[PDB]
Write an enzyme that holds these catalytic residues in place. Structure first.
Site, PDB file in Angstrom:
ATOM      1  N   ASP A   1      39.394  11.947  -9.610  1.00 55.49           N
ATOM      2  CA  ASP A   1      38.774  12.216 -10.944  1.00 55.49           C
ATOM      3  C   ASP A   1      39.025  11.186 -11.993  1.00 55.49           C
ATOM      4  O   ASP A   1      40.008  11.164 -12.308  1.00 55.49           O
ATOM      5  CB  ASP A   1      39.065  13.594 -11.599  1.00 55.49           C
ATOM      6  CG  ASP A   1      38.213  14.267 -12.469  1.00 55.49           C
ATOM      7  OD1 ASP A   1      37.876  13.498 -13.633  1.00 55.49           O
ATOM      8  OD2 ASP A   1      37.847  15.409 -12.387  1.00 55.49           O
TER       9      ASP A   1
ATOM     10  N   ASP B   1      31.880  10.958 -11.364  1.00 55.91           N
ATOM     11  CA  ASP B   1      33.066  10.524 -11.743  1.00 55.91           C
ATOM     12  C   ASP B   1      34.128  11.239 -10.695  1.00 55.91           C
ATOM     13  O   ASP B   1      35.456  10.962 -11.003  1.00 55.91           O
ATOM     14  CB  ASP B   1      33.555  10.566 -13.092  1.00 55.91           C
ATOM     15  CG  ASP B   1      34.371  12.113 -13.537  1.00 55.91           C
ATOM     16  OD1 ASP B   1      33.872  13.092 -12.879  1.00 55.91           O
ATOM     17  OD2 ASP B   1      35.379  11.995 -14.245  1.00 55.91           O
ATOM     18  N   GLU B   2      33.925  11.844  -9.646  1.00 53.72           N
ATOM     19  CA  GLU B   2      34.522  12.646  -8.972  1.00 53.72           C
ATOM     20  C   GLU B   2      34.264  12.996  -7.390  1.00 53.72           C
ATOM     21  O   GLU B   2      32.886  13.019  -7.355  1.00 53.72           O
ATOM     22  CB  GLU B   2      35.311  13.875  -9.700  1.00 53.72           C
ATOM     23  CG  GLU B   2      34.360  15.043  -9.483  1.00 53.72           C
ATOM     24  CD  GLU B   2      34.704  16.117 -10.179  1.00 53.72           C
ATOM     25  OE1 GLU B   2      34.988  16.043 -11.506  1.00 53.72           O
ATOM     26  OE2 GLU B   2      34.976  17.333  -9.785  1.00 53.72           O
TER      27      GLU B   2
END
Ligand code: MG
Ligand code: MG
Length: 342
Positions: A9, A104-105
């Site tokens: 993350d 983003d993860e």
DNA sequence: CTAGGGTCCTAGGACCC
DNA sequence: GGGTCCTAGGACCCT
């Protein structure tokens, strides 16, 4: 038979990218979000802004009262998408078992990995170091035997850190874990659970599955499982996009169909351009529209339709406008497409 | 003082058996 | 009566 799941993350992702690309923003409070005049909200903020209480989803007027010097940025989504692609490629060097959850993860299933002597801890550290080395952005990570525990773990040592939960650690971790920390248990569910005396997974452990099924349906089974560390969901590298939407909130409510139709004429080219990136022939399963009124009620109306068509969206918006508006002002107009199944 | 990008679940009537 | 489709709404997720 215990899996090794990593959740990676990025830290303050949008803000972190803007500080990298503009070092002047590093030490002052910044946030990506729409202006107060645009009736915007904060997408995210950096740590100087968060110290004032600035948070994602906060109305920008509230953010600015907490942090009067907050620097507001519009966002550079191609820059974010580029960093996203890069970290996903970094993930691929370690495993093909990659389930991205957002830009983003991602979850990683490294159960069968040969890297770092099979140490999921050391893999997560290599991945975070590599991301820093190649993108000059920091990431945090969580390591656990199942997805949801790994996702919780990646928050516990943010920013630029990681947290590992072993099977032997799982019961102590669950005992006092707030239900609200489980992904998918939101504010409404946490408040319902609170008002029946259920705050933590340890509270839910003392509950009967049958009662939870009656009181919450299939969600009740999820709650019962998660409260025990049970999460059999496999990392799935094959998920596909199902919809494309384009919507805008106006700075002032509109009250006339002419204004609504003008909005749609500007939204439609954007919807067409984004559909065309994934379906050049514009063939779709359904298309529809969205209105949000001044009382924040929202209606959608969508229908089977073979191919993106502006006039039918205007026509549908006209019906919704006439039929479900009831004289209220309109703050948002949206267009929507449901993609074909394959 | 309340975004924009989405996924998933529910639920009633239609339709099919 | 049971499946599945169509549709609307809403909780929830990310930034
Ligand atoms: Mg993040
Ligand atoms: Mg994230």
């Amino acid at each position: 038979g215990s899996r090794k799941i990593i959740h990676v993350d990025m830290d303050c992702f949008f803000a972190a990218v803007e500080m990298r690309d503009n070092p002047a923003l590093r030490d002052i409070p910044i946030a990506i979000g729409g202006s107060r005049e645009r009736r915007g909200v904060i997408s995210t903020a950096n740590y100087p802004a968060r110290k004032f209480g600035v948070r994602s989803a906060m109305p920008t007027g509230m953010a600015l009262k907490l942090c009067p010097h907050l620097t507001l940025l519009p966002g550079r989504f191609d820059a974010y998408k580029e960093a996203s692609n890069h970290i996903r490629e970094i993930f691929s060097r370690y495993t093909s078992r990659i389930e991205p959850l957002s830009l983003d993860e991602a979850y990683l299933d490294v159960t069968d990995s040969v890297h770092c002597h099979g140490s999921a801890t050391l893999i997560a550290q290599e991945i975070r170091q590599t991301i820093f080395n190649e993108l000059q952005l920091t990431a945090s990570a969580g390591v656990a035997p199942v997805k949801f525990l790994a996702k919780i773990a990646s928050d516990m040592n943010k920013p630029n850190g990681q947290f590992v939960i072993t099977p032997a650690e799982v019961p102590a971790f669950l005992q006092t874990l707030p239900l609200a920390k489980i992904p998918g248990v939101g504010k409404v569910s946490a408040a319902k659970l609170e008002a029946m005396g259920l705050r933590t997974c340890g509270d839910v452990q003392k509950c009967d599955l049958v009662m939870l099924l009656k009181r919450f349906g299939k969600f009740g089974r999820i709650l019962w499982e998660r409260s025990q560390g049970i999460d059999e969901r496999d990392v799935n590298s094959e998920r596909l996009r199902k919809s494309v939407g384009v919507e805008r909130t106006m700075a002032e409510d509109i009250h006339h169909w002419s204004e609504c139709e003008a909005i749609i004429e500007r939204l439609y080219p954007e919807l067409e351009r984004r559909l065309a990136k994934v379906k050049p022939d514009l063939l779709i399963a359904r298309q529809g529209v969205k209105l949000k009124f001044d009382d924040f009620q929202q209606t959608t109306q969508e229908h089977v339709w073979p191919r993106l068509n502006k006039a039918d969206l205007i026509a549908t918006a006209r019906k919704t406008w006439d039929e479900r508006r009831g004289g209220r002002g309109v703050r948002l107009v949206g267009l929507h497409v449901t993609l074909l199944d394959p």
